[PDB]
From a paper:
Porphobilinogen deaminase (PBGD; EC 2.5.1.61), also known as hydroxymethylbilane synthase (HMBS), is the third enzyme in the heme biosynthetic pathway. PBGD catalyzes four consecutive reactions to convert porphobilinogen (PBG) into hydroxymethylbilane (HMB), a linear tetrapyrrole heme precursor. The holoenzyme (Eholo) carries a dipyrromethane (DPM) cofactor, which is covalently linked to a conserved cysteine residue (Cys261 in hPBGD) through a thioether bond (Song et al., 2009). Mutations in the HMBS gene are associated with a genetic metabolic disorder known as acute intermittent porphyria (AIP), giving reduced heme production and severe metabolic and neurological symptoms (Bonkovsky et al., 2019).
The structure of the mutant R173W-hPBGD agrees with the ESI FT-ICR MS analysis, representing only ES2 in its reduced form (denoted R173W-ES2) and thus revealing for the first time an AIP-associated mutant trapped in a reaction intermediate state. The incorporation of S1 and S2 in R173W-ES2 causes a major rearrangement in the cofactor-binding loop Leu257–Val263 including Cys261 to which the reaction intermediate is covalently bound. In contrast to wt-Eholo, the active-site loop Ser57–Lys74 in R173W-ES2 is reoriented toward the C-terminal helix, α33, allowing the accommodation of the additional pyrrole rings in the active site cleft between the domains 1 and 2. Because of this rearrangement, the new pyrrole rings S1 and S2 take the original places of the C1 and C2 rings of the DPM cofactor in the wt-Eholo structure. The created cavity is not filled by the relocated C1 and C2 rings, and in the structure, a glycerol molecule occupies the space between C1 and the protein core. In R173W-ES2 presented here, the active-site loop is oriented in a significantly different conformation, partially facing away from the surface with Lys74 establishing several interactions with C2 and S1. Trp173 has different side chain conformations in the two subunits and has two alternative conformations in subunit A. We also discovered rearrangement in the helix α22 (residues 170–179) in subunit B. This rearrangement allows Trp173 to adopt a completely different conformation than seen in subunit A. From this point forward, we will only discuss the structure of subunit A, unless otherwise stated. The conformational change seen in subunit B of the R173W-ES2 structure, where the bulky tryptophan residue turns away from the active site forcing a change in the domain structure, probably also affects the loss in thermal stability. The substitution of Arg173 with tryptophan introduces a large hydrophobic amino acid, predicted to hinder the cofactor and/or substrate interaction severely. Both ESI FT-ICR MS and X-ray crystallography show that this mutant accumulates the ES2 intermediate with a greatly reduced turnover.
Author numbering: 17 to 361
Write the structure that this text describes.
Amino acid sequence: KMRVIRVGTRKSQLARIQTDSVVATLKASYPGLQFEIIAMSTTGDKILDTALSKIGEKSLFTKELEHALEKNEVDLVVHSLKDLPTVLPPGFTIGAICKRENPHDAVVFHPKFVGKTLETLPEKSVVGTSSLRRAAQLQRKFPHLEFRSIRGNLNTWLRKLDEQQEFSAIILATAGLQRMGWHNRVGQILHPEECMYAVGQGALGVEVRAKDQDILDLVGVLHDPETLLRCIAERAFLRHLEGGCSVPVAVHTAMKDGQLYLTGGVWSLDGSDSIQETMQATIHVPAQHEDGPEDDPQLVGITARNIPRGPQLAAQNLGISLANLLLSKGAKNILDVARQLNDAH
Ligand SMILES: *Cc1[nH]c(Cc2[nH]c(Cc3[nH]c(Cc4[nH]cc(CCC(=O)O)c4CC(=O)O)c(CCC(=O)O)c3CC(=O)O)c(CCC(=O)O)c2CC(=O)O)c(CCC(=O)O)c1CC(=O)O
């Protein structure tokens, strides 16, 4: 008579690990409840057909899992929160924001360079990254290094670094290496003054059907209030800038002393044009849960009716406030130019 909770996952190693970690946490709250993990790999030729824009191989993967949700083949999927756009299709929502892992970008160094930092690499060292945000910030901070795209999966990146002669280092998210059990490869954790992280980096988001109240009820136990509020602010900031996908936008948040701090910035692709500012608001981390009404609208794609709504609205307002500041200083022109340049391919 029950529902069996079907959990859809991509087939990549990191996605499978993330999915299973969320399932384990759910089973800890709901022992005996039946879960079924369903791995999906279907070639998404039909989603590219309907697209009026270039999608990209990664963005295609997210759309494929929403298709599984829409067709009632699975009941929830687990994403890195930074892979979920700030505007979701109307039938979907993020029903859980899990406790954040390390949000910072990290450096892995060529083995001859143990003990080094980007600051102490030889001039003209070649550093691999395929992220426009990382390349923009790091080119500005480190004008005497060379930042180049690097092809392949993580295992290929690390093999190229250990075996070949091109790259002195690579940049990637600390959280990915953490989840791979490979934190011992990290040689430097980048601070906001070197490289601020992507909106939502390090948090997992659970996507579900927007009106599937039974599943929303179950997964709401996963919401971490502090991570929820930080990520609402980061995503509201990004949404309100109204830039395209991918262009260089980065953030830093902290909740401390009863305050929520949000730093946000935009960069041209080469890093030479930038605007960054910090704002704060008095918001404390709620310790109580609640049973908010089903009519409450989601906030930047997130349904968290069991967490007090006042602080969520305040976090959203902080992000909007900071976006409006950046826009009054010319952020739209920086974002538009970056989008047009990145639309060349
Ligand atoms: C319009 C619009 N679209 C999107 C979806 C979207 N997100 C990104 C961010 C992204 N993702 C990755 C790959 C990655 N994902 C998770 C990890 C591990 C760390 C973690 O769990 O947080 C990784 C790898 C890693 O960082 O080490 C990257 C890295 C580059 C890559 O492999 O593709 C990034 C970019 C970055 O961090 O700077 C993207 C961009 C992907 C790209 O490289 O261009 C996209 C769009 C796409 O797939 O084309 C968003 C959400 C962005 C956000 O919230 O951060 C938006 C924003 C909007 O609505 O305005």
